[PDB]
Amino acid sequence: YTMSLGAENSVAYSNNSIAIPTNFTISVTTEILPVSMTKTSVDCTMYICGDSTECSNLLLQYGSFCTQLNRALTGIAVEQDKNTQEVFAQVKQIYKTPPIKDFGGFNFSQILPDPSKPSKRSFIEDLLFNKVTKFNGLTVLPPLLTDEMIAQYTSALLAGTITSGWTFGAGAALQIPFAMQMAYRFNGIGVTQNVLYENQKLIANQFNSAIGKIQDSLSSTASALGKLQDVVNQNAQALNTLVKQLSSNFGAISSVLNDILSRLDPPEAEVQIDRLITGRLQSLQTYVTQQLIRAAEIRASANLAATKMSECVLGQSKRVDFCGKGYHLMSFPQSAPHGVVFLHVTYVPAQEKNFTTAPAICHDGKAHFPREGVFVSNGTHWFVTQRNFYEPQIITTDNTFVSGNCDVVIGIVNNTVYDP
């Protein structure tokens, strides 16, 4: 069939009709981002020839390709280390959560680590690590920061976030209750703090329900972490191809260097050795080029992940669709194998309701424009409410400002302002 671009919809657009939401919902999303790869090391001589003095002497006539490839692999390893370094190691002091989890009703026990396990990882981190699933010159180097250290870094970031908001990124960590932190987060997008101070229970229940839904999804679906598994599979296929490229003859008698050396004298086997060396060197150069391209891609991804960390966890960004889809409130980092997982808590308005609007009101000849809000009407009476939450207020002189006359504005309606 032909793919559908989406459901059809026709917005009821007019010149005196506005839609103001009367409710909202908390939506916690999930964004997977690759950070680093498996630091591999390919011994050039051992891979090309392999414990062969004559073949090594023949390979030495090609220049410094061995040193070039070794330097490239070392640079790739150092880059994969510095990527996760700059991504996770961003906080100076390691913070911890207080024993009294008095967070105003929010339940973070599912994202905070528990001491009833060797590795201090949370339930989400355990799910993420459980879902993601010597040689002939091939050896893998272990990363500098272990999984336990990455989990400790994520726990310190989470504790600093919960305890400070965004002050732990600029200067020093400042204590602040999570209720007032969420009030500041709401004030940072256009919603007043009274909405939170009145619906804290509903917001905490919605957050707990979203966390539970995320847990259920991560426990049910195994294809959640896609890009990490794709990178792992690409690295595995590259390694398997590099290994299988040793069973090829490349025009020689056989692919076994020791068998060639035992069957033919050096003067006659020099040609076969040269063919094998050229073939394996071309294959290794192609592998190194592809690995450099993939390392550049992973570096770009790690830079993006570090930027998202600094702009969502250590502060509330105003960039649209950056810290998740919707009005960004806060974000929680989660460790993942060779990657990072963010939990973008967004603000999504719901229960839309259409009303009648007007640009201004003309009370006594002079026009009155609202300072912060929009003039709405429920059919007979006019009120001034917020932009993202329907809160009708009586139109007074403290909610509007006068600027000129009302004979230049097109669409102004007549109303009676109130003087307190």
SS3 333: strand
**394 touches which of a second copy, ligand NAG, another protein, none (CB within 5 to 8 A by kind)?**
none
DSSP symbol at 104: T
Gap between the Cα atoms of 90 and 336, Å rounded: 17
The yes or no reply on residue 56 touching a second copy (CB under 8 A) is no
- Mask of contacts with a second copy, 171-210, x by CB under 8 A? xx-xxxx-xx--xx-------xxx--xx-x----------
Between the alpha carbon of residue 280 and those of residues 128, 137, 253, 255, the distances in Å are 38, 13, 15, 11
Residue 277 backbone dihedrals phi, psi, to 5 degrees: -65, -45
Residue 180 Cα to chain centre, angstroms: 26
Task: Rank residues 56 and 208 by Cβ distance to ligand NAG and give the closer one.
Answer: 208
Closest CA to 207 of 256, 164, 162: 162
Gap between the Cα atoms of 209 and 149, Å rounded: 30
Gap between the Cα atoms of 181 and 185, Å rounded: 6
Task: Rank residues 304 and 402 by Cβ distance to another protein and give the closer one.
Answer: 304
Candidates 2, 4, 10, 380; binder of ligand NAG (CB under 6 A) is: 380
Task: Rank residues 211 and 242 by Cβ distance to another protein and give the closer one.
Answer: 242
- Write down the least CB distance from residue 15 to another protein, Å: 47
- Write down the least CB distance from residue 401 to a second copy, Å: 8
Gap between the Cα atoms of 329 and 344, Å rounded: 8
Residue 403 backbone dihedrals phi, psi, to 5 degrees: -150, 95
- Write down the least CB distance from residue 86 to ligand NAG, Å: 29
The yes or no reply on residue 200 touching ligand NAG (CB under 6 A) is no
Between the alpha carbon of residue 361 and those of residues 195, 401, 406, 420, the distances in Å are 27, 11, 8, 17
The yes or no reply on residue 310 touching ligand NAG (CB under 6 A) is no
**133 touches which of a second copy, another protein, ligand NAG, none (CB within 5 to 8 A by kind)?**
none
Gap between the Cα atoms of 172 and 233, Å rounded: 42
Closest CA to 301 of 375, 359, 228: 228
**419 touches which of a second copy, another protein, ligand NAG, none (CB within 5 to 8 A by kind)?**
none
Task: Rank residues 119 and 167 by Cβ distance to a second copy and give the closer one.
Answer: 167
Q: List the interface residues with a second copy, window 319-348 (CB under 8 A).
A: 319-322, 325-327, 346-348
- In the sheet that holds 366-370, the strands lie side by side as 361-362, 366-370, 400-405
Q: List the interface residues with ligand NAG, window 100-159 (CB under 6 A).
A: 100-102, 107, 109
Q: List the interface residues with a second copy, window 259-298 (CB under 8 A).
A: 274, 279, 283, 285-286, 289, 292-293, 296-297
Candidates 137, 160, 315, 337; binder of a second copy (CB under 8 A) is: 315
Radius of gyration in angstroms for the set of CA atoms belonging to the chain, rounded to a whole number:
31
Gap between the Cα atoms of 342 and 223, Å rounded: 17
Q: List the interface residues with a second copy, window 118-157 (CB under 8 A).
A: none
- Write down the least CB distance from residue 4 to a second copy, Å: 36
The yes or no reply on residue 9 touching ligand NAG (CB under 6 A) is no
The yes or no reply on residue 378 touching ligand NAG (CB under 6 A) is yes
- Mask of contacts with a second copy, 220-239, x by CB under 8 A? --------------------
Site residues (vs ligand NAG, CB under 6 A): 12, 15-17, 23, 25, 100-102, 107, 109, 202, 206, 351-356, 362, 364-365, 378-381, 410-411, 413-414
